[PDB]
């Protein structure tokens, strides 16, 4: 659903991927956790969406950060909202970037 928010990036730092969701012909969804609490829900789709081309380069990193609980930050585009998760207290939004976190470099 197009929320109409003014198409700005959103920075969510020090998160790890849990609770993958997927459907047959639809998008895949992931919850992101920090210190045991949910922070953001980011999803990617190869069938519909502004970032439909994004999906291969996204799945190349989502699989890694799901297999390895590495330090990850999520750049989220909030134009589109999703309600795939049943009774989701955490907001679900579109996924535009995944960046591995390096505390030593202090970038993340």
């Amino acid at each position: 659903y197009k929320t109409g928010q003014p198409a700005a990036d959103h920075y969510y730092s020090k998160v790890t991927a849990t609770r993958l969701l997927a459907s047959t012909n639809s998008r895949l969804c992931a919850v992101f956790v920090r210190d045991g609490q949910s922070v953001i829900g980011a999803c990617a789709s190869p069938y519909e969406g502004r970032y439909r081309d994004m999906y291969d380069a996204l799945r190349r990193l989502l699989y890694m950060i799901y297999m390895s609980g590495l330090a990850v930050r999520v750049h989220v585009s909030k134009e589109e909202q999703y309600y795939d998760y049943e009774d989701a207290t955490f907001q679900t939004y579109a996924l535009t970037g995944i960046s591995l976190c390096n505390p030593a470099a202090s970038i993340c």
Binding site: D53, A57, L61, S99, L100, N102, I107, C108
Partner: peptide, 21 residues
């Protein structure tokens, strides 16, 4: 290569930006 980070390119919708630290 310490960190791997990828993003959408702000110039055109026709290019990914795969990057790192």
């Amino acid at each position: 290569v310490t960190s791997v980070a990828m993003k959408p390119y702000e110039v055109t919708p026709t290019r990914m930006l795969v990057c790192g630290i």
